[model samples]
Target chain A: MDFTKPETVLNLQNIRDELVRMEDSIIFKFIERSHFATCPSVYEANHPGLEIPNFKGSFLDWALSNLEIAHSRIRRFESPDETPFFPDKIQKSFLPSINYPQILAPYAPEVNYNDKIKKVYIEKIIPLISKRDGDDKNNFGSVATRDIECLQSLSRRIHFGKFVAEAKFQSDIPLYTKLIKSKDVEGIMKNITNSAVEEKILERLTKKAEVYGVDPTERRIIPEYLVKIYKEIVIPITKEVEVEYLLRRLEE
Target chain B: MDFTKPETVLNLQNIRDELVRMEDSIIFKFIERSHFATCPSVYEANHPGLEIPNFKGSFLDWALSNLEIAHSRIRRFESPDETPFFPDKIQKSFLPSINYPQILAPYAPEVNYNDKIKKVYIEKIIPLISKRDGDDKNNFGSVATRDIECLQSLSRRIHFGKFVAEAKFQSDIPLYTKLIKSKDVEGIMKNITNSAVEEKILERLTKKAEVYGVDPTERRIIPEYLVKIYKEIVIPITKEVEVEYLLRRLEE
Candidate 1:
């Protein structure tokens, strides 16, 4: 979907298509991640014999933030779909700003789920995707690079809920506005929920994951784990984003 | 494959398995690159309307060098397989040095083909793999990111000839030693050329590319283009690397 074209960006069909495309990218990233071990030490803030001066987060965070810093200069975050975890750390682009048409609520950027996304990805997804579970001094940098891509893809996929939320909100504004006014969180969620679409999404993920094996040598990600991730984390949190965005929609 | 274990790393079978795994990575990267336009502006040194102060190269080079600098700080180039395009710019890692066992000839890093790899990638491969023939101002960073991965994977795949050279040298030292003593470049080339293996590689690439498309929305990388890239650029350059490495192998 072209962010420059508001109509295209807001189309529910376009949003769904984009999300479907994102699945391929997410799976590709997962396959790359599968080549390495979990490397749990990379996740520690104060791990033995590993220290970055004045850095407050894990090694993966340091690499991720450093990349954001570099990419922000190159205008990576200007695209509407990009949501930076270290928003405060990102800089203005060297290129002219994209001036993307306002495609979502002004508060859309405020609804970032990256912190939670990172948490689940490290705690949940990595175990299923990684080859074996141990650190390799040789692979830490490669691991971080793979992690950055996977997390960014996941973050983009999860945060895409804002567009879905905005599309649904715009489609039937009065009903959502009424639901929001009543402070009916359950009503808002139920209104947004499409059990049929969710089931379709799960079935589609299973089909996609089944056929997406990279190689026989490396550990391939299973369909059940992929479906489980979407069912348990990706889908639920997306609805939360939709609900959260809608609840705040009727303001001002 | 296991760099820490010299025996595993030097074994011809193990090296071939690793090379096979890298093929999946290169294809995945190409599939990602297929999502965007050729993005020519990203390759110009002094392209109009785009300039970074005090940088002497294309946008891809700047981003690549910047990543090398960051990754180097994390000791990315410390690995035997990594050959940086801007090796002079990389920094010492914050972490301790990994004292890997001496694997290749000491002159291995000097045999970098990254500059040539980057040239052919932008000139030849991009046209085939890209979705279209134009630029997206918003996607420059993503384009450069994709290019870096493609170039690096290509570099790794091509430069793997050093390992191939070393493996063959160790396996048949007397034969290679006599060939080297005679300064017989043709004989060395003939000795290294495995027509059966090369044909198998091309067929394997054809099979892999056909089955490995990301999604229908994006243009898939055709097997012919992939096979052409390997046959013309990747395979030939790799042999050159093998020849060059062997020429220097008898040194001291």
Candidate 2:
């Protein structure tokens, strides 16, 4: 959807299509990550020589944070869809502002799910997709780079909930306003739930897993695990974003 | 192939298999890049408002060079296969050296084709793979990021010639020694040109194009242009690398 125009972005159809495109992108990122072993050392905080001198985190944290800092200088954060994991470390942009029309609410950036997304990705997702369960010390750089790519993609996919929530809210404002006023979290959840859409999403992810990879083993593991991830992690977290965004919709 | 294992890395079959894997990677990177408009400004050197302090280069050069610097600290360039576009700007690694086996010739890194690769990629490949022919103005960062990904993949694919040359040279020492002594560039080129293998690569790429991406239009453009690229650019440059490496084989 075009960010310069509000009408294009707020349309539910456009948002769904955008998310559909993101599915392929996310799938591609996952496939890239599947090539290497689960280099757990990359994720360990200050794991011996893996430590950065002036920094206080994992090798991945240092790599991802530095990359984000470089990206921030390019106006990457100016796009509402792009969120920084290390918000405190990002710098001001060097490019002139695109002056994108304000589409999401003022506090939209604050409703960040990157921390949770990162946790589940490291704990839940990596093992399922990785080639094996050991460190390739020689490939620490490759592993960290792939992890950052996967994390950024997953973050973007999950956080797309803001657009979906805004579109649904605008479609029926009075219903949401009353639900918000009553603090009816369950009611809001019930209204946002679409079993048909979720089922379709799972079905598509399964089919894509089969079609995308060259390996038969990957076809089996990818479909089952990805379906599980979407159902258990991706979808639920998305709804959480939708609910959280809606709850604060009436503020200010 | 394992970089630390000289025997495995110098094996021709292993090198071919690694090249096959890189095919999917390069395709995935190209597909990612296909999503955006070809923002030519991203490649223009010192374009107005895109200049950096003490840096006299393209917006992409600045982004890519800074990324290389960060990656260098993580020992990205320490790997034999990894080559930096801005080699001069890259830094020393913070991590300890892997001290990989010396599988390639001493002058292997001198066979870098990144300058030629970058030139063709911006002038030729981007137009074929990109969605349209205009700058998004807002997506310069995204375009540049994707460009870097594609360029790196292409660089690795082309520079794989070192391993191929090493493998072939070791397999037939006397034949190569004769050619290297005689300085028969044409003989070396002829010996390296495997018509059957090149045909198989092109055939696989054509089939993959059809199997990949959601758009039928992409299938047509991707296959035809990619086939042309492999035939005209990728394969030719790869042979150049192989010939160059073999020509310098008797240095010591």
Candidate 3:
């Protein structure tokens, strides 16, 4: 049978090695959880003995098509009041284990803010500082210079308080604060005396920060209608853009 | 560079085709819904064109492992207590598209016994009877017969129904029957008479058929209990086993 042929020897060795590699990559369970009965399609596509074609963009196109096709089939089987079986329990449970919004909690360790900050500092800052010279490292002069320039730019629009608000809310708060803090509480209060009035004003101002994460079509709106002032407002304003910038620096 | 080499060609083709197949087996997210990040473990397992040991089995193991694993992971981050973050005024408007569980009237799908009987007949009897004539057709009879026998051997067991107070417990209505007929108000109420019972007994005895889809666990008490009754009572009294036994003889 020519069992001792060089190619045959290599082929047998390859098969043995392949089994070990498969053992190491035990992610098939995750796929099954997500795809359920639909996974056979994936398996057939990558059959060990079958050689097939690959296209790069087709990853998404193929996946989406299969998903849509499967979904369509499922949809056809549904009657109006029939119970919908959702296949995302795994996705749901593991949310806290990933980062932030992506965290899957069951597998997540309980962590405090101090511990988090320390972890971040040690993991991030130490590496960067280690690569730098003494003057910038000891005094933080390199970082401070950038901060002063940013503060200088922000100082241009108003007195620090008004400037802060303008910088934060694009100057809407200053007009309100100027009326109220000017010993004209009655007048400023009149501007937003009715809930509707504040809605009208806040609608034109105080837009929400555009944070990263999943943004759905329906979730984009922030309610401008529910504003109520407690007393005369002391506006401490830093723009969301700036706050984001600060956060980004800290993250870096 | 030598695409003509059989190994190179096979490996290359295998990798690409599998990737395409995977493409055909994915979920499509058109909107801003949060898509799950693919796990590193899964990614490694699914990698195409690799000749590795235990790759396929490892993939299957991982797939099964992650089904429950991912479910638990996703569950932890979700807060059942948090109402949808949509503004209350607009909440009603967006209900149709949201993924949250419906909090509506109790689920009450009316049981049309005739239709249920018809379905059971088609599912359980149609093929078996046809085969008794030694009909040259698709061997659905043989297949279903094999399946039933296999299931019977696995599920049958004897249990002392002491969990429910004997005097108060109404009848020996099998657990499977109650599950099949949830509307059997008297039967369901009777099982609940005892405040304290073995957790396993209730868990096994009270489940609806196919509740867990596949065997929940090896030597799981529920299936064993179910099999026992079908073999002892239902098969003999109903003559269901006679028909199957005759078919088995006819085949011989």
Number of the top-ranking candidate, with lDDT as the measure: 2
CAPRI grade of model 1: medium
- CA error at residue B93 for candidate 3, angstroms: 48
lDDT ranking of the models? 2, 1, 3
- Of 2 and 3, the candidate ahead on TM-score is 2
lDDT of 3 by residue, A200-237 (tens): 43432222111101021121112221111101110112
CA shift of A88, model 2, Å: 1.0
Q: What DockQ would candidate 3 receive versus the native complex?
A: 0.01
Clashes of each: 0, 0, 44
Better of 1 and 3 by lDDT: 1
Q: Against the true two-chain complex, what DockQ does each candidate achieve?
A: 0.50, 0.48, 0.01
**Residue-level lDDT for A119 in candidate 3:** 31
Choose the strongest candidate by DockQ.
Answer: 1
Q: For candidate 1, write residues A1-252 as lDDT tens digits.
A: 778989988898988888887888888889888989999989888676567767878888899889999999888888879999899999988776778877888888899888998889899989888889988767887898899899998888888989998898889989988999998999988888899988988887877676665542123778888899889988898888888888898785
Instruction: Write one digit per residue (lDDT tens) for candidate 3, span B1-252.
Output: 112232432243443333222221111110000111112222234434212234352222323232223222222112111111111211221111224332111111111122222233234432222213322112212222222222221211111111111211223435524432454434434343233533333343334222211121111113443434334432222222112221222122
Q: What interface Cα RMSD is found for model 2?
A: 3.8
* Shift in Å, residue A186, candidate 2: 1.7
Q: Model 2, DockQ value?
A: 0.48
**Residue pairs clashing, model 2:** none
Q: What is the lDDT of residue A14 in candidate 2?
A: 88
